[PDB]
């Protein structure tokens, strides 16, 4: 087993339970059963003063075998119009997101979500028209 990886992910799991950060993003395991700690769920409170306000975004984050040496994969479950996000799958294009494009082994799920929230408030995204609330790329 990958001790460094396993250890790091447990640290993140614990930080997600103590609400590290400003409380506007959260994360945890998707099924709390898989001890592989591969599939996580992310959450971002839409930033006030943007067209994302009053909405909560659900995302899926995957931390592969090479994590955290390699970046995790990310995708919105909640439909969103934002630079870097595919309009049919919700998949986040890593090269469109700095922390993913230039990933560093010191980053984390927390950092990815915090960066996504910052980008949400950025001039290029904050006034983008959004689809009807509650929509998801599935179900």
Swiss-Prot record:
PROSITE patterns: UBC_2. InterPro entries: UBQ-conjugat_E2_core, UBQ-conjugating_enzyme/RWD. CDD domains: UEV_UBE2V. One of its GO terms (cellular component) is extracellular exosome. GO terms for biological process: DNA double-strand break processing; error-free postreplication DNA repair; positive regulation of double-strand break repair; positive regulation of protein K63-linked ubiquitination; postreplication repair; protein K63-linked ubiquitination; protein polyubiquitination; protein ubiquitination. Keywords: Acetylation, Ubl conjugation pathway. The keyword Transmembrane does not apply. Transmembrane segments: none annotated. Detected in placenta, colon, liver and skin. Detected at very low levels in most tissues. The keyword Isomerase does not apply. Induction: Up-regulated in cultured fresh blood cells upon treatment with vitamin D3. Residues 4-139 form the UBC core domain. Heterodimer with UBE2N. Binds CHFR. Has no ubiquitin ligase activity on its own. The UBE2V2/UBE2N heterodimer catalyzes the synthesis of non-canonical poly-ubiquitin chains that are linked through 'Lys-63'. This type of poly-ubiquitination does not lead to protein degradation by the proteasome. Mediates transcriptional activation of target genes. Plays a role in the control of progress through the cell cycle and differentiation. Plays a role in the error-free DNA repair pathway and contributes to the survival of cells after DNA damage. Belongs to the ubiquitin-conjugating enzyme family. This is Ubiquitin-conjugating enzyme E2 variant 2. It comes from Homo sapiens.
